[PDB]
Amino acid sequence: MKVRASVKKLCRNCKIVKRDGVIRVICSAEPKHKQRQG
Amino acid sequence: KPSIVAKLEALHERHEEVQALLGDAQTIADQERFRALSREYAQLSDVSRCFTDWQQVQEDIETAQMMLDDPEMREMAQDELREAKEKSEQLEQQLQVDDERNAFLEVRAGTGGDEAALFAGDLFRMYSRYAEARRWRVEIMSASEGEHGGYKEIIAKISGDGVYGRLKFESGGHRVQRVPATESQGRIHTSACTVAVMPELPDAELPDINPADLRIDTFRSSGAGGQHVNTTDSAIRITHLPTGIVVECQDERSQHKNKAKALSVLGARIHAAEMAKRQQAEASTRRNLLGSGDRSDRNRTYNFPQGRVTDHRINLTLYRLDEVMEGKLDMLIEPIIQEHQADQLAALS
């Protein structure tokens, strides 16, 4: 999990979701890509 | 092939055994060993191929000499012609090999005194003539005169393209036996001169003051300064993390001045700690290369009464001294390079 002020899609499998008012990135391929904005 | 023949035969045997080693699938399991064998195989292969061809030509030469009732002359003549041609080809193909940078030549007198100076002058003249008949550049850096003759010690810097690869073997001690110029009688005298050849190297300084690897402590000063000095952090101490030098300052009232002065002193110390290390390394290398002039630890000998130059590393004697002293010492260098390269190929255990 990367906590940063600038979250982007890295691979083609990353997705942008909003969960309880917080933006975060999840992809099914590489668990190195999941991020949250903070 | 005086002596290199045995080494090349052993080299061929090594080529055969690595042929065997690269077909087992067990030495293939580990990859460092397989990589090393594959790397070393190529020079083994081509040199061994040439050596086997020369061996076959030689065993052809041996045959047909003990035969009569036929004009053996022309075919053996062409056989020895192609034999010599193949030998020259192998020499030129395996002698060479990198390091081709310019060189520093320092030659100084040893045993003998006022006559070792004269021989040092003669030896330097030889080397300078060799450099000149190569379109190289020679300039003198340091010189100490030898009273009666040439130089007690002369340090020059020879500049070209491939100087070191040829002049690296001229280091050690050189012995001369002759009737000197500083002699009232007709006695023959022995003396020696020490030669050091080193490569020229870059000395790129780095400002090892990276502000990311410093520990800076600020605290109160110690001494007489009244009320101001008590409630103020005006004293600095800087620690260099890798090197370990710690320098501190309380000279001035301002913190910034203390930091500047202490940082400058730290830089000076870290620079001196590098100069005073490379200097000792270079001094040790020059001491271990230079030998010690004692007319008993020498790499080659010159004899003017017999007009003979001999090399003790490879036991090579030639009666062309008068040619060598004029700067034709390329015939004293080629065998050394060839045999050293053969040795370097051998040292692959």
């Binding site: - | 055969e16 055994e17 065997a20 080693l21 087992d24 030495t27």
Partner: protein
């Protein structure tokens, strides 16, 4: 295979005595190369190398730390043998039974050592 050497090299005689006796006992064979006289103990498994130092310290008074000489598969052997012996000398050693053995480097580097000769090179002594 491993190489054995002690901490006070002034106690070589006791090392030889202990090694020959413990070689009489079980299966710890001893080799001394034709050159540079450095002992090599060849056991059947690893724990022998432990118990040998354990006894050599407990009963005798030598320490004898180990080395890691590379070798595998020693093989025992008129003028027919003599000529090979003088030809290939750096790889021949004496046992503790004063026999002769050919210390190779690897089995692949041993076949070429027997492909060139009419020598039986049987190993298991008589």
């Amino acid at each position: 295979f491993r190489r054995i050497r002690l901490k006070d090299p002034l106690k070589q005689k006791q090392l030889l005595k202990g090694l020959v006796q413990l070689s009489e006992e079980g299966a710890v064979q001893v080799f001394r190369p034709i050159s540079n006289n450095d002992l090599i103990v060849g056991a059947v498994g690893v724990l022998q190398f432990d118990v040998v130092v354990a006894r050599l310290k407990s009963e005798y008074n030598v320490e004898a730390v180990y080395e890691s000489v590379n070798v595998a598969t020693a093989r025992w052997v008129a003028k027919k043998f003599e000529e090979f012996k003088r030809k290939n000398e750096s790889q021949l050693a004496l046992d503790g039974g004063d026999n002769l053995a050919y210390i190779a480097t690897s089995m692949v580097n041993l076949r070429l050592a027997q492909e060139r000769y009419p020598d039986v090179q049987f190993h298991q002594t008589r």
